[PDB]
């Protein structure tokens, strides 16, 4: 009853797409680079944005028409194309072809309104904060418009605190921070502020991995243990105690256990050897799928310890 109508309509759609595709290839072979091609491809690309040859056909048409149309006619075509693209992105926001066509179009305009494109990105990131295509496009727009890293840094903070799904936003921060502090390895005052920010994040949502991955990076981005300032030493010891408190709240949370180990390494590997081994045992019991990783990590750390003990005068 209800399934045959669905089978038949989808058969009709396929016949239309095939006919329209046939028409486009025939027009192309005939050298007919005109608006009828734009009409035909619009019927196909909405549902099938990965049909790359059809995006190429649209570009050939737009290039041809630019040569023969008034500047005002050409501007009208560009605006129609921007609207078509946005309607396509709303249906399928994860198509490489659609985002590339938008990049191609914007890159050739006199002309372009980049602030409006940044807003298009903000809108799509509100819908899906993990859409890498949209983040990549945002990076493109920001480079084209010469948006300052500090501005982009303020954007990431708002996205990290307003809700979760933060891996993409933490990633962006990891790229922006070294720009605000560019060396030919973050400065400690910067690092300490980041540690504060990320620690807020993993105490708010201890289950999400993004803050824990970012934190591990931060723990390597600094001075070195033999170089710890009293402030940094004190901050890392405070973090160690806070992770132990989280361990009590969430006994199945493997991220906090791993981080306890990494903090002890950052503070004093030999002094904390006993506790490090104890934590590896607990952690392997809590996260058994990672047991081989954890054994290799422990082996690495024990070899580091041997080398440290052999340095002994």
């Amino acid at each position: 009853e209800q399934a045959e109508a669905k089978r038949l309509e989808r058969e009709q759609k396929l016949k239309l797409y095939q006919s329209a595709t046939q028409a486009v290839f025939q027009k192309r072979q005939a050298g007919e680079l005109d608006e009828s091609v734009l009409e035909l491809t619009s019927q196909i690309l909405g549902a099938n944005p990965d049909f790359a040859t059809l995006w190429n056909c649209r570009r050939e048409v737009l290039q041809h028409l630019e040569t023969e149309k008034s500047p005002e006619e050409s501007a009208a075509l560009v605006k129609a194309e921007l609207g078509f693209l946005e309607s396509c992105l709303r249906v399928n926001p994860k198509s490489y072809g659609t985002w590339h066509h938008r990049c191609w179009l914007l890159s050739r305009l006199p002309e372009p309104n980049w602030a409006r494109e940044l807003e298009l990105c903000a809108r799509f990131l509100e819908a899906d904060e993990r859409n890498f295509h949209c983040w990549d496009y945002r990076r493109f727009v920001a480079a084209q418009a010469a948006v300052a890293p500090a501005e982009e840094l303020a954007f990431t903070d708002s996205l990290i605190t307003r809700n979760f799904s933060n891996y993409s936003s933490w990633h962006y921060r990891s790229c922006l921070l070294p720009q605000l502090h560019p060396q030919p390895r973050l400065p400690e005052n910067v690092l300490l502020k980041e540690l504060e920010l990320v620690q807020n994040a993993f105490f708010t949502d201890p289950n999400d991995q993004s803050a824990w991955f970012y934190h591990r990076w931060l723990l390597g981005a600094g001075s070195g243990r033999c170089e710890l300032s009293v402030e940094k030493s004190t901050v890392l010891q405070s973090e160690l105690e806070s992770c132990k408190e989280l361990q009590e709240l969430e006994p199945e949370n493997k991220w906090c256990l791993l981080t306890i180990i990494l903090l002890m390494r950052a503070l004093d590997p030999l002094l904390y050897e006993k506790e490090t081994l104890q934590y590896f045992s607990t952690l392997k019991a809590v996260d058994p799928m990672r047991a081989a990783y954890l054994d290799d990590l422990r082996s690495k750390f024990l070899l580091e310890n041997s080398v440290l003990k052999m340095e002994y005068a």
Binding site: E11, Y17, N48, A52, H100, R139, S168, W217, R290
Partner: protein, 327 residues
């Protein structure tokens, strides 16, 4: 934490006969006009079917002569190869075509000199590669370029140091790689970039312990692997992640038995084929990546597979293209 739940009745045995039957009959089951919507990737579709059949020892059941004629018809005057007749050339389908011709030891079916010129023409000043003349830059295309050229014995045709510099500029805080500089790490681009670095003899530049950790954390309680944090696991991501781990010498960092069980659960017991996830509709793409994953996990009934080229190792031995891996 987002994960699939495998049901107690999921397949738990390898159904190789059904998979070979499935692929041998693929594209004969519906009317011609129905299949249609995937013509834009046909050359890669052909590669998936042929490669999985060869891994299963059943390549002869496919139509060699028909496919060679098809490939010849898909090479354009610029040297590049398209997905299908009348479609436009692209590095993706140029790779797929050269992979197929390598399987069949029929490389001179196409004009090799012109393929090399096409690939060479797509390299940019920064060492990156565009996919075609329209200029989309992606590390996927760096891999397509060097993999195509390695198979042809012509890696020296491109600017290799600049290509390497570009790929390394895409390395991230977490040890992974994205599309372009500044792009977030993704299993697909990690696979392309680690494959690229294997081909160019640059795996010493990877932080294998850091990247290995990011990769082994893709394994969910179901046993399946996802392609980045907070995604559902699937057979495609599972191959990309497992192959990357193999390239960097850390395959043992995932639970191999749990992954095997996940991949087997994606088989369709009635039709053959694998789907992206348990219960879903099968396709040749996931059939290849499921069989390939099982092979890397040690399945004796399947030929050893290259984690770099996703082709039988015995084929790559024949052309003497076997990049050293980390271990």
């Amino acid at each position: 934490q987002k994960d699939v739940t495998i049901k107690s009745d999921a397949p738990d045995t390898l159904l190789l006969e059904k998979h070979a039957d499935y692929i041998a009959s693929y594209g004969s089951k519906k009317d011609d006009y129905e299949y249609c919507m995937s013509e834009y990737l046909r050359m890669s579709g052909v590669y998936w079917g042929l490669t999985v059949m060869d891994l299963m020892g059943q390549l002869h059941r496919m139509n060699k002569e028909e496919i060679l004629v098809f490939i010849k018809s898909c090479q354009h005057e610029c040297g590049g190869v398209s997905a299908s007749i009348g479609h436009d050339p692209h590095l993706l389908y140029t790779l797929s075509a050269v992979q197929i011709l390598t399987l069949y030891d029929s490389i001179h079916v196409i004009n090799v000199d012109k393929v090399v010129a096409y690939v060479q023409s797509l390299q940019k000043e920064d060492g990156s590669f565009a996919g075609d003349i329209w200029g989309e830059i992606d590390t996927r295309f760096s891999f397509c370029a060097v993999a195509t050229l390695a198979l042809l014995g012509k890696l020296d045709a491109i600017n290799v140091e600049k290509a390497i510099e570009f790929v390394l500029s895409c390395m991230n805080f977490d040890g992974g790689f994205g599309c372009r500089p500044g792009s977030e790490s993704h299993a697909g681009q990690i696979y392309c970039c680690t494959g690229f670095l294997a081909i160019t003899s640059q795996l010493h530049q990877v932080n294998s312990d850091l990247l290995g950790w990011w990769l082994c954390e893709r394994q969910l309680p179901s046993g399946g692997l996802n392609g980045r944090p907070e995604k559902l696991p699937d057979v495609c991501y599972s191959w990309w992640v497992l192959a990357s781990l193999k390239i960097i010498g850390r395959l043992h960092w995932i639970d191999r038995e749990k992954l095997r069980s996940f991949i087997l659960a994606c088989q369709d017991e009635e039709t053959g084929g694998f789907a992206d996830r348990p219960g879903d509709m099968v396709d040749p793409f996931h059939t290849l990546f499921g069989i390939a994953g099982l092979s890397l996990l040690g399945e004796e009934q399947i030929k050893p597979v290259s984690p770099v080229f996703c082709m039988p190792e015995e084929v790559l031995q024949r052309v003497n293209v076997q990049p050293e891996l980390v271990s």
